[PDB]
Design a protein around this nucleic acid. Structure first.
Ligand SMILES: [K+]
Ligand SMILES: [K+]
Ligand SMILES: [Mg+2]
Ligand SMILES: [Mg+2]
Ligand SMILES: [Mg+2]
Ligand SMILES: [Mg+2]
Ligand SMILES: [Mg+2]
Ligand SMILES: [Mg+2]
Ligand SMILES: [Mg+2]
Ligand SMILES: [Mg+2]
Ligand SMILES: [Mg+2]
Ligand SMILES: [Mg+2]
Ligand SMILES: [Mg+2]
Ligand SMILES: [Mg+2]
Ligand SMILES: [Mg+2]
Ligand SMILES: [Mg+2]
Ligand SMILES: [Mg+2]
Ligand SMILES: [Mg+2]
Lengths: 153, 118, 262, 206
RNA sequence: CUCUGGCAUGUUGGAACAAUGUAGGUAAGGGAAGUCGGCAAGCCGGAUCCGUAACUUCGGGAUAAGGAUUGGCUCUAAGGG
RNA sequence: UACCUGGUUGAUCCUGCCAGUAGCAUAUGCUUGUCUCAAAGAUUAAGCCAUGCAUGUCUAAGUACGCACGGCCGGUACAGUGAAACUGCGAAUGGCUCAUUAAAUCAGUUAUGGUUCCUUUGGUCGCUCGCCACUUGGAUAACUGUGGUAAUUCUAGAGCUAAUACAUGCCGACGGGCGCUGACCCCCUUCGCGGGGGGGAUGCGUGCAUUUAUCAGUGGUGACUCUAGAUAACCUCGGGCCGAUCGCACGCCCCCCGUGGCGGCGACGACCCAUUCGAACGUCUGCCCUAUCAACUUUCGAUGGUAGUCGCCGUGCCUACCAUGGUGACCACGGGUGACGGGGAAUCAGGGUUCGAUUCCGGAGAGGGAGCCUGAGAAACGGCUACCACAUCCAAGGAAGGCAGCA
RNA sequence: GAAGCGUUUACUUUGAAAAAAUUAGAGUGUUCAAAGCAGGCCCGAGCCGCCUGGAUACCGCAGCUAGGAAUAAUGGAAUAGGA
RNA sequence: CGUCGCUACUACCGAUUGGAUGGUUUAGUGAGGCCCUCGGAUCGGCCCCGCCGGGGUGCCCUGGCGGAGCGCUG
């Protein structure tokens, strides 16, 4: 549906919709401006977030979250939560006694902005650390790369 | 146990007395202590009863309404002396302050004046 | 703990204070001041273990009370005042002036300086910002802040500051090929010239510095402190000229010095 | 007392967490303000670091801004009509950060006439003559009158807003935090946001 | 408990309110000491939300056991054509 | 120092264990002349404690009318030393112990663009147009005096007295400027109209800090919904700042005069910014044994979204409405630990195996729990309140406790 | 001198930062040593004082940086939706 | 080699709805603190204003007793 599917009204707090639309301007359609920011560190803001209509206060690009700290990647595992997904990170732990490695994993729940519409299970996502968004969410999805696909039969 | 104003019951009760209530001085800042106090109504079971005369009668009580004791020492602030002595302004304010005389046997007589503030 | 710590164990004291293990259990524990306690010298050690003027803690207490110690143009009675880096310790009764600069081994050394070269001081601007009514402010590596600076001074530059006035006499721009001094880490106390400033967004910048002998070393941007215009240092460098020498050559330097003195 | 700690919760996997210390003061919570509408009663609570927080138990006057006209006036709150958090907060007439409330529109009417010189909020006119007959005419000169009709072509109020000016009450959304700042500032609803909340109120009872 | 319909209290009435009885209640403190024996009486009890053991032919035990709530009034949500 | 030896057989080669062998680390036994260092009620009982001490503090610079001394130098507010007390600060450090605690603590790393911060240092303190100021008000200590109580570092009534305690509250800069409101007036294309500009009387707001809303884009970020500007306003009587404070030498101006105005060095003080000491919650990786613990979490927040509450701040921290999520054989969950973590210690070819109660860093606790006052900082215990367990005095009416501090 | 890598990692080398104490270890006749961080030169007596040291190494795994690209994993153009 | 008989020691099963000591909790009661809503034992100020009074000249500048304004308020 539209962006008003709840008990409150969503809007980007930096945007004033009611900019005195009088006869000097044709009403309508005066398309409301969209707040968007470059998150830095070389990441490119997606075109969907530039011109989309969704509201997400936790979005890295159209929300009030700043990426700072560690940048790291993972593999999407589940997508059965609202605006947030869990990713699995595989690494090897070294054991000195046996001079061999040990395969370990840690699941991380990360916030997935609606700008990344084209996200399946198994994709590679780069996440950046932000302020705690939920009880167990501290990373926000910055870039989505397909998993040897981009073509579907 | 001292009697406290406003308790409003004959007998003894325990109160969490904070700073500057009554019947308690704190040993440190913010300290509150639970103490036993006596109610404000009097009865037979009281050791003493502090009473204050508010007006005079027909004659003098022996040993009470006679040999009036002076205030130990006079005013100090430069305005509390003006109110007591009707000083207007710069009427030799320093000299009008009360000068207390000191008289000890093992010493010469001498009078002592206090430092006046403001 | 339930509040601020006001003790410093002798073992836990910074190494460059060069304190021993047997005199006592505690350390000066410097008071709060313009410099962090890890890279500051309390006045107590400076007048007891550096110059040996005082023997014990109460002896350095008497000298500070008599008010001849004058740090950065101001008399300081604090026994544990944090001196810091390139601060002028002027004792006028004895006529000696000290500029507190690290030696070659990353330790503060006694640097006697001339009286007229004590009237100024170098400083590293750390944050630049504009205050109310549009007044630009400037805070240095010390806790000293000034208003109305020259708009060409940016962050991590050097400002030529004269004492008793607090104004900016001149300034040194941060640029490639400028003489600097490292103020922290392994390369602490090494005099050299900027060769390259690589930058890392979101992280600390790394700069590459080459000394007079040609040795090239790197460090973080927060440990850089430019003290010269290109090649010429603006302060009297301490003995050793801020040059780092490996274990091989101070040994033969002792043998040569011993043989000459023998 | 009330604790804001994270160690009393279950960990992410669902296991139980054993506390390694008792409650600490820095992780405390205080009882809710539950700000009502009434004569001003503001309590001061001392918070971390010796600072001061203004508990606002009761408010009756707030500072609401028109926004589209850049007009901010100190007006009186009447009641609370909608609350996105809980429906009970409206029932008990409690002022929270985002609840929408009805405010008196007289100060905005006064500014409108003294700035635009067009009847707003009036039904038929010629009823408050001892002042309105003077504000409309002012017998002003060539340039001031020429300065007033240049404020006329942009003089227009939305149908939803002018309808509420007829009723004498404007519904507005609080923007401040009573119980923290001790005051109930906000903004007047316009546009799609105003339409969205009118639909919500209508669905509530209409 | 009441309306339609039906009746006159069951083959007599009146006056009193003794014992003993028949039928029905209550009883301080104790709580089966009564008795062959808890006989008799008493306790519990509906519904909602929890929570339920040994054992077992795995079906049961099971309303196991144990605990909380329950009125009135004013509302608010959800469940349709 | 990269090491072996005795023992199964009538005898032999093995497997294999037992015993021997060396270190250190607790106890114990015997013995002990010198000297330098030096651990030491951790292990069982974080079991119980008599007694004594362990946290107090004044400079010239907040307040001295104690005779407790004392210069008197003698006609004066206060010479000076000063007990007591009010005030300010400290008492949240240190010291002790290791019971709890198994992604918890802790270590390395990183963030607060998600916060607070006494003090120190440096900024700021005429930026605000608005009948005491040559200094305003009341009480209270200490002190005198009357007691009560078996008892306590218990206190009441009565009578004084001060502040850098507690309140109140100006002048001054200050002449104005700016932005709105605009009485009117003037120059105007002039012409019978519009006119394009100026002045302007009169009223309203003007600074920093706070809470909103709006506009534009002097410096800064990797990235602000940053900093700084502009506008409309707010600015909480348990209510922000806009000095009613204290010493040191003492001087200049004298037209007006002649009795005032000016003056330096400090101290104390502050709203706010920066800094320092931090603190707090977070990022990544890392922990022993156990499956005779395989499925846990989710009514009672479990995972996430929205809007709030609360908190110093980000966050299910809490509430309401929603979605059904979240973690697990890569060992979840549960249980055990004779588990405080680490730096480190012992052994020493290499690899490892044990040990770290214990002087340094971090955490936790103060008999067991729980809840709070003050303060910048405590869920403090050589602070308070309550309960539980112990336990002290009593005239039985009450009162007082916390050695896992040093002894 | 500004921009990207014509994959992404593991791996290896370098650099940064990595508390002290402890360990290894430089210097130093504590009367030797365990230790400690001290100490040494002349004095003809004016020496109205001179020269030093208080190094360095290691710090596992994880995180940051810059070189190499052999081994190992992972991808690009197959309905061309390719350069 | 095993039963059987005697003697010691070690565990095992076992009626006793056995017993004892810890830990985590359901439910009920619930001290105490804190917050909110009340409450008002007391304690001040203004209105003093029955009066003597009075001064710029009965129109009070007031020196204070004193009723108490039977209120406004902290
Ligand atoms: K009868
Ligand atoms: K029976
Ligand atoms: Mg004074
Ligand atoms: Mg009958
Ligand atoms: Mg009949
Ligand atoms: Mg019949
Ligand atoms: Mg009975
Ligand atoms: Mg009974
Ligand atoms: Mg019987
Ligand atoms: Mg019987
Ligand atoms: Mg029966
Ligand atoms: Mg049964
Ligand atoms: Mg009910
Ligand atoms: Mg333990
Ligand atoms: Mg340990
Ligand atoms: Mg503690
Ligand atoms: Mg304080
Ligand atoms: Mg405690």
């Amino acid at each position: 549906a539209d962006i008003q599917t709840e008990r409150a009204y969503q809007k980007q707090p930096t945007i004033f919709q009611n900019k005195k639309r009088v006869l000097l301007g044709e009403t309508g359609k005066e398309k409301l401006p969209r707040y968007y920011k470059n998150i830095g560190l070389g990441f490119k803001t997606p075109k969907e977030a530039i011109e989309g209509t969704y509201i997400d206060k936790k979005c890295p690009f159209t929300g009030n979250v700043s990426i700072r700290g560690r940048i790291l990647s993972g593999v999407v595992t589940k997508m059965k939560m609202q605006r947030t997904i869990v990713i699995r990170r595989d690494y090897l732990h070294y054991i000195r006694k046996y001079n061999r490695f040990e395969k370990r994993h840690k699941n991380m729940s990360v916030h997935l902005s609606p700008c990344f519409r084209d996200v399946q299970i198994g994709d590679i996502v780069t996440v950046g650390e932000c302020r705690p968004l939920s009880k167990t969410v501290r990373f926000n999805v910055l870039k989505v790369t397909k998993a040897a696909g981009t073509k579907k039969q | 146990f001292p009697m406290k104003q406003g308790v409003l019951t004959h007998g003894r009760v325990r109160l969490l007395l904070s700073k500057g209530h009554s019947c308690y001085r704190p040993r440190r800042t913010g300290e509150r202590k639970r103490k036993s106090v006596r109610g404000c109504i009097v009865d037979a079971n009281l050791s003493v009863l502090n009473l204050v005369i508010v007006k005079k009668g027909e004659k003098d009580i022996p040993g009470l309404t006679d040999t009036t004791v002076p205030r130990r020492l006079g005013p100090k602030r430069a305005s509390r002396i003006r109110k007591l002595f009707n000083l207007s302004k710069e009427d030799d304010v320093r000299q009008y302050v009360v000068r207390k005389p000191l008289n000890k046997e093992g010493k010469k007589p001498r009078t002592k004046a206090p430092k006046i503030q403001r | 703990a339930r509040g601020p710590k006001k003790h410093l164990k002798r073992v836990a004291a910074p190494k460059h204070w060069m304190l021993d293990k047997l005199t006592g259990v505690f350390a000066p524990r410097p008071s709060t001041g313009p410099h962090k306690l890890r890279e500051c010298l309390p006045l107590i050690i400076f007048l007891r273990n550096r110059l040996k003027y005082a023997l014990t803690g109460d002896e350095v207490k008497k000298i500070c009370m008599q008010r001849f110690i004058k740090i950065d143009g101001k008399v300081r009675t604090d026994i544990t005042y944090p001196a810091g880096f390139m601060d002028v310790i002027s004792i006028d009764k004895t006529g000696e002036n000290f500029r507190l600069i690290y030696d070659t081994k990353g330790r503060f050394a006694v640097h006697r300086i001339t009286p007229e070269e004590a009237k100024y001081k170098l400083c590293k601007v750390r944050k630049i910002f504009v205050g109310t009514k549009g007044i630009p402010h400037l805070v240095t590596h010390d806790a000293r802040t000034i208003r109305y600076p020259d708009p060409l001074i940016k962050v991590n530059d050097t400002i030529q500051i004269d004492l008793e006035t607090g104004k900016i006499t001149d300034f040194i721009k941060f640029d490639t090929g400028n003489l600097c001094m490292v103020t922290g880490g392994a390369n602490l106390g090494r005099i050299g010239v900027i060769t390259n400033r690589e930058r890392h967004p979101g992280s600390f910048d790394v700069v590459h510095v080459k000394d007079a002998n040609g040795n090239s070393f790197a460090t973080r941007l927060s440990n850089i402190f430019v003290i010269g215009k290109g090649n010429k240092p603006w302060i009297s460098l301490p003995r050793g000229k801020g040059i780092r020498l490996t274990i091989a050559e101070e040994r033969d330097k002792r043998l040569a010095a011993k043989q000459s003195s023998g | 007392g009330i604790s804001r700690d994270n160690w009393h919760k279950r960990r992410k996997t669902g296991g139980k967490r054993k506390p390694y210390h008792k409650k600490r003061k820095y992780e405390l919570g205080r009882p809710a303000a539950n700000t009502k509408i009434g004569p001003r009663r503001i309590h001061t609570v001392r918070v971390r670091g010796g600072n001061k927080k203004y508990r606002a138990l009761r408010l009756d006057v707030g500072n609401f801004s028109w926004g589209s006209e850049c007009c901010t006036r100190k007006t009186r709150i009447i009641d609370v009509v909608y609350n996105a958090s809980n429906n009970e907060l409206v029932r008990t007439k409690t002022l929270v950060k985002n609840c929408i409330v009805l405010i008196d529109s007289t100060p905005y009417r006064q500014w409108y006439e003294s700035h635009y010189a067009l009847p707003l909020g009036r039904k038929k006119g010629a009823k408050l003559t001892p002042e309105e007959e003077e504000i409309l005419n002012k017998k002003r000169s060539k340039k001031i009158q020429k300065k007033y009709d240049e404020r006329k072509k942009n003089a227009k109020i939305s149908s939803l807003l002018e309808e509420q000016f007829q009723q004498g009450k404007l519904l507005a959304c609080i923007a401040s935090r009573p119980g923290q700042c001790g005051r109930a500032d906000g903004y007047v609803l316009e546009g799609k946001e105003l339409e969205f909340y009118l639909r919500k109120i209508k669905a509530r009872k209409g």
